[PDB]
Amino acid sequence: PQITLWKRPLVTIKIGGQLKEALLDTGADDTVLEEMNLPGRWKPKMIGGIGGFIKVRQYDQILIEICGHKAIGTVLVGPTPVNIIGRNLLTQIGCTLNF
Amino acid sequence: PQITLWKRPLVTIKIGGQLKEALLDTGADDTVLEEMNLPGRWKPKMIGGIGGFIKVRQYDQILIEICGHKAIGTVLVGPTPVNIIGRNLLTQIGCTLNF
Ligand SMILES: CCOP(=O)(COc1ccc(C[C@H](NC(=O)O[C@H]2CO[C@H]3OCC[C@H]32)[C@H](O)CN(C[C@@H](C)CC)S(=O)(=O)c2ccc([C@H](C)O)cc2)cc1)OCC
Questions:
Q1: How many domains is chain A built from?
Q2: Which atom of ligand 1 is nearest the CA belonging to B87?
Q3: Where do runs of H (alpha helix) occur along A1-99?
C-alpha cells in the first residue's frame, strides 16, 4: 500500500503469534519492541536514541509479519516508548520513501 | 524520487540560509535540528525518545527546503545527535511510504 504521513504510520504486526501495533520508522536502523515474551535464546545489547541508551534483549532471525508482509530478522526488546519497525525489516518488506 | 532504505535516508536540507544533512524520519512527529542560532522568538520544550528526554528550543514558521521541495513549519533546535526531518515537514513535500 501507499501510506501518507499526516498521521503516525502505525500498522498491525504479528510476532510470536501475537498481534501488536508498531510504527514504521525510517529513522531507526533497527527494530525495537516494548517489553514482551519471545521464545528462544537472546543476547544483551545496548542501543542509543535521542535521549540516551537503553538495555535491550536481542532476538535474531525472528519471524514477523508487518501489514501482511513477512520478515525474518533481528528484533530488539526493551523499554522503548513505542514499538518501532526499523530499516532492517522495512527493507525486507520492500518499503521505500517516495515524494 | 524514490529512496530505498538499505542505508540511512540522508538528504541535503536548506534552512536559515545554511545547507545541512538531515534524516527523513517517518517515526518523528516533528522536526529536530542540530544546535543553530536561528533568529526570532522561541519557547522551551521537552522531547522524548529512546533514552529519555532532551531540552530543545521550538521555533515556529521556519522555512526548510528538502531536496528542492520547500516546507514551512515548526522546528525544534537542541542537542540532537542527528538532524531529523519529521512528519510535520515530510507531509508538505508529499512524502509517502510504499510497499
Ligand atoms: C552518533 C550519535 O548517534 P546516536 O546513536 C542516536 O542517533 C539517533 C537518535 C534518534 C533517531 C530518530 C529515532 N530513531 C531511533 O531511536 O532509532 C533507534 C532504534 O534503531 C536505531 O537506529 C537509530 C537509533 C536507534 C526515531 O526515528 C524518531 N524518534 C521517535 C520514536 C522513538 C517513536 C517515539 S525520536 O528521535 O526519539 C523523536 C521524538 C519526538 C520528535 C518530535 C518532538 O515529534 C522527533 C524525533 C535516529 C538516530 O547517540 C546515542 C545517544
A1: 1
A2: 44
A3: 87-90
